[PDB]
Design a protein around this ligand. Structure first.
Ligand SMILES: CN[C@@H]1[C@@H](O)[C@@H](O[C@@H]2[C@@H](O)[C@H](O[C@H]3O[C@H](CN)CC[C@H]3N)[C@@H](N)C[C@H]2N)OC[C@]1(C)O
Lengths: 247, 149, 346, 49, 148, 50, 50, 50, 50
């Protein structure tokens, strides 16, 4: 919720304050964005140990942690050794055409991105696609029709789609000569879009049921719709492998 | 005595009226015995990249210090320790090393038939071994079964 | 414990058993027992050795059919693994499912038990167990004015443990837990004893809107790398090398359906990495020795005279090793190099 | 001494765990041999004299 | 009080997805048990500096801690450079029998476990007995009786 | 608070909770349909509860 | 000192969620004591306006 | 809970939010006025809604 | 500095309202009086503050 100028004045500048004077520091570069994300990029002299640099930055961070706003501290501040060496940019394309671009992106982000990100020397893997996510498209006209609000849908989903830690049968301490000990599972995470369409927002006194599908368009889509990649003019998804420093 | 609800009549519903309160373990998962007697145990796990023997010696020493304030009847008993085998093995290797030095001295005395002549190669052994230990310290190695062998 | 304190009471210094903790994962059905032997001097050194004790114990324990009690020696290297023998992870690359993975695990264990080349092949984990499933009719729940959050809260606080806050006891701030009394959480029918409160304040029984159903599940799920896996530890039969046993296990996992692969871990991983550098070492060392001799004697012939006595020591070292029934290992290799050096000096 | 150290020097170069084990023996024995050279040409001649 | 599936979904998988970019990571093994404990063992290549490995793991983990369930956060996740084998397993027994198993475990966890965990070289020290806690045992019959 | 929550959820995707998808845990997002968050006047289409 | 302060900070991260919300809002700082204070500059308003 | 809140945010401070002052974010503290938290009898001056 | 702090110590010992001591700063905070000792009288039994 912070404007770009406000973010720069309150967060980025404060972070830059103490870090000036770090050993083997060449220059700093803040990139205070307009959505409320700050980014300070410190570049050290060649031959400096990246780990030691990260440790030093983290240690200097706690000096200026108190000066940051409460919301910034609650969100948390992350220090990562960032590079720009793109070793590979692999593009995934469905030759048959049976897979939509979202299907390709989901498959990559679910089965390919994680195994490749563990390979030795791979500092980071930028993803040009996003995995599947249960998109609940609200309709304000329908919500007003049923005297519902957006928070009603959110609370209903957050209550009827939760994983509960119930416990065990015959968990210790137990009565003597207990016969069986078993885990007690409970309401589980939903899996199909039709299950979400059947989420009951409100049961009327007359027995009428206001299902989620009555006020929304449940459909499985992309977690992040921002990215859209095309390889040789065809829909595709890609991974950008970034080399870890010193490999 | 935690009050859950005070009725308009004035009769309060305390916690003890609806539940039973007792002081027990926070986790009831473990139930350990030592030689058929009730007991509780601790598993000390070595930090990665640290000397096992030194850590175990420090732990036990600390335990002794703590033992001073134990309630009457409470005693600690090491049930599974690994550094004992290491120490025994190293002691055995030192024993066989000294025995080897003695046997070499005996053989050299037999062949040379002169005690004065025999002493000369014998003295060369501790000097070389101490130099080897100095080299080991310089290179950052440690006294282990391989080095002792 | 009775077995250990009766059959072998001249070698056991002390036993320490911890019910609820196991090498394959904690649980009420597992227990790990730490046995500490007496000094080597007091033991027989012929029948009281750790290996003989473990053999007799494992016979007596295979006699036991109520549970799977396994007596194992500590690993050769403290860091690598929890017990001696090969260590393998049976992954599920295709993502078939937990049930398919368990079926493949049972199939692989059966195949291993078929081959006598492998001994004590077992799953270092917990077998699947029946587990209760409480399914709540959401529509029926809120038709009675009972919030789903309320029933979830009472269910997780009653059957599970609820850490509310801390209290101070003799100087330490210990935790406070709220849970159902033991007699009221032992059977599936105990769910119906709980009453939730609706909007109007009336109390509704759990039987009104909740039912229970048995289902199979796993008390412990393990994931090697990013794939669901079942660790399968074991031992190699006498005679057959550990590498050969590992290759046999690879053949077995090949016999499994598609989608399941193996990845050796810890001691097995390191053993698979190494062990093939010997012949190279010998060859390079011999070449270096020949070159040094050529430098010393200023000839390409005298070293051949010297280098021919290496076999004269190698044969004796090999004969001594085989005669005592020892094994070609790291210690043996270094011995061979020392023998080569001494023969060269002579 | 040169040949004795020659049989052991390559042993250390090998990597891995096995290489580490070898390195332990190698470093120890090579140092012992070098010191034996030094001792045999310094201390023992003086003792014999 | 969680389940094996619940842990493997909400905790173990979440941690694994963030354990990315670790240097010299040979392999990682994770397990989700029905006892309510989830673990992720990241074993690094030999020669790696344990402190650097712990630094990297903690740096990656801290991003995902807010994603974990509230109860897990309240309990707190721990990152230790420890193995699995116990270098020594100490057993505490009451010779006189005055203190039962719970008293012995409480005394250990109160006065002994913490000082030992701060000894140099001790990566971690798990306990085979938990400290005292004000256990409150609800009676559903009485709860319904008082309409609570 | 209701006004701010409605605005945030309608125009910004609100990550409610997770759902299970073929063994992978994936996020659930709630957001307004595309045609209802395109013009500045689309804000007037929403109703809060008195 | 950097390694020590890093370890202390890492151990603290497993506890900041157990602290009272007020303490978390105020923030918990990990510092290496023993720094040398070169100067102590005091700012005074001669006019008295400030 | 109301009693404890009134005591905590009246006699003790309460860091509620942050406000932007001249391009910088300061803190907002809510507390009782000085004359109302000086004596033990000042406790009785506080009222709690049932 | 030594004469000044000596006179100050005399004049401040004359003061009875409070305890005020004037002392030169130690060169290193770690070093103390060679005859001094720091002891922490602990409570192992958890007897209580009183
Ligand atoms: C053990 N003393 C500490 C210790 O943290 C040490 O760690 C270094 C580690 O940074 C180096 O690792 C280095 O490895 C590559 C360099 N070519 C790139 C990453 C870099 N950290 C290791 N090669 C040696 C350890 N002792 O780095 C700093 C220190 C003060 O010397």
């Amino acid at each position: 919720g912070a404007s770009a100028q406000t973010l720069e004045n309150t967060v980025t500048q404060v972070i830059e304050q103490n870090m000036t004077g770090l050993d083997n520091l060449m220059y700093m570069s803040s990139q205070s964005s307009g959505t409320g994300q700050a980014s300070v990029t410190l570049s050290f002299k060649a031959g400096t140990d990246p780990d030691e640099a990260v440790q030093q930055v983290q240690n200097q961070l706690q000096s200026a942690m108190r000066k940051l706003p409460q919301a910034v501290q609650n969100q948390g501040v992350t220090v990562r050794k960032t590079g720009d060496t793109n070793i590979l940019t692999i593009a995934f394309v469905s030759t048959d055409g049976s897979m939509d671009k979202q299907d390709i992106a989901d498959y990559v982000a679910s089965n390919i991105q994680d195994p490749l990100s563990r390979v030795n020397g791979v500092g980071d893997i930028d993803a040009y696609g996003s995995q599947y996510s249960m998109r609940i498209w609200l309709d304000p006209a329908k919500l007003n029709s049923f005297q519902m609000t957006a928070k009603d849908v959110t609370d209903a989903i957050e209550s009827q789609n939760a994983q509960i830690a119930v416990g065990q049968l015959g968990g210790t301490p137990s009565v003597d000569k207990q016969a069986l000990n078993a885990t007690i599972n409970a309401q589980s995470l939903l899996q199909t879009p039709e299950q979400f369409r059947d989420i009951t927002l409100r049961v009327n006194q007359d027995g009428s049921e206001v299902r989620l599908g009555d006020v929304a368009t449940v459909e499985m889509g992309a977690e992040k719709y921002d990215y859209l990649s095309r390889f040789n003019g065809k829909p595709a998804s890609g991974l950008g492998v970034k080399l870890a420093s010193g490999a | 005595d935690i009050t859950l609800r005070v009725n308009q009549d004035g009769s309060e519903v305390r916690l003890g009226d609806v539940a039973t309160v007792e002081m027990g373990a926070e986790k009831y998962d473990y139930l350990s015995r030592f030689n058929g007697k009730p007991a509780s145990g601790l598993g000390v796990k070595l930090a990665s990249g640290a000397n096992e023997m030194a850590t175990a010696e420090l732990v036990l020493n600390r335990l002794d210090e703590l033992a001073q304030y134990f309630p009457h009847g409470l005693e600690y008993k090491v049930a599974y320790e690994t550094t004992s085998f290491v120490k025994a093995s190293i002691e055995d290797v030192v024993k066989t090393l000294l025995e080897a030095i003695a046997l070499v001295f005996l053989v050299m005395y037999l062949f040379l038939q002169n005690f004065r002549a025999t002493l000369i190669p014998t003295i060369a052994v501790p000097v070389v071994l101490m130099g080897t230990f100095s080299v080991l310290y310089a290179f950052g190695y440690s006294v282990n079964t391989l080095t002792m062998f | 414990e009775k077995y250990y304190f009766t059959h072998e009471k001249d070698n056991i210094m002390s036993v320490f058993a911890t019910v609820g903790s196991g090498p394959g994962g904690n649980g009420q059905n597992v227990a790990r027992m730490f046995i500490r032997l007496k000094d080597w001097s007091e033991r027989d050194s012929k029948t009281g050795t750790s290996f003989a004790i473990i053999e007799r114990a494992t016979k007596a324990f295979n006699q036991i059919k109520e549970a799977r009690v396994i007596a194992s020696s500590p690993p050769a290297i403290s860091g690598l693994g929890s017990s001696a023998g090969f260590d393998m992870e049976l992954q599920d690359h295709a993502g078939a499912g937990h049930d398919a993975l368990m079926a493949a695990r049972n199939q692989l264990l059966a195949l291993a038990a078929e081959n006598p080349e492998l001994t004590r092949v077992r799953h270092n984990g917990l077998d699947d167990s029946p587990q209760l499933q409480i399914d709540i009719d959401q529509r029926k729940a809120q038709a009675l004015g009972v919030a789903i959050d309320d029933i979830n809260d009472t269910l997780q606080t009653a059957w599970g443990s609820s850490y509310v806050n801390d209290f101070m006891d003799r100087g330490r701030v210990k935790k406070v837990y709220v849970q159902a009394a033991a007699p009221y959480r032992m059977l599936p029918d105990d769910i119906n004893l709980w009453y939730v409160r609706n909007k109007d304040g009336g109390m509704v029984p759990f039987s009104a809107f909740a039912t229970s159903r048995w289902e199979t599940g796993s008390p412990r799920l393990e994931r090697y790398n990013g794939y669901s896996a079942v660790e399968i530890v074991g031992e190699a039969a006498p005679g057959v090398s550990t590498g050969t046993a590992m290759d046999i296990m690879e053949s077995l996992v090949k016999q499994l359906p598609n989608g399941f692969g193996l990845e050796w871990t810890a001691m097995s991983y390191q053993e698979r990495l190494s062990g093939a550098q010997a012949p190279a070492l010998y060859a390079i060392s011999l070449l270096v020795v020949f070159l040094c001799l050529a430098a010393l004697y200023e000839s390409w012939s005298v070293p051949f005279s010297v280098m021919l006595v290496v076999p004269l020591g190698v044969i004796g070292a090999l004969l001594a090793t085989w005669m005592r029934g020892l094994e070609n290992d790291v210690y043996f290799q270094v011995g061979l190099l020392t023998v080569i050096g001494l023969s060269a000096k002579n | 001494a040169m040949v004795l150290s020659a049989v052991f020097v390559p042993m250390a170069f090998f990597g891995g765990t096995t290489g580490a084990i070898y390195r332990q023996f190698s470093i120890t024995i090579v140092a012992a041999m070098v010191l034996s050279v030094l001792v045999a040409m310094i201390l023992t001649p003086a003792l014999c004299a």
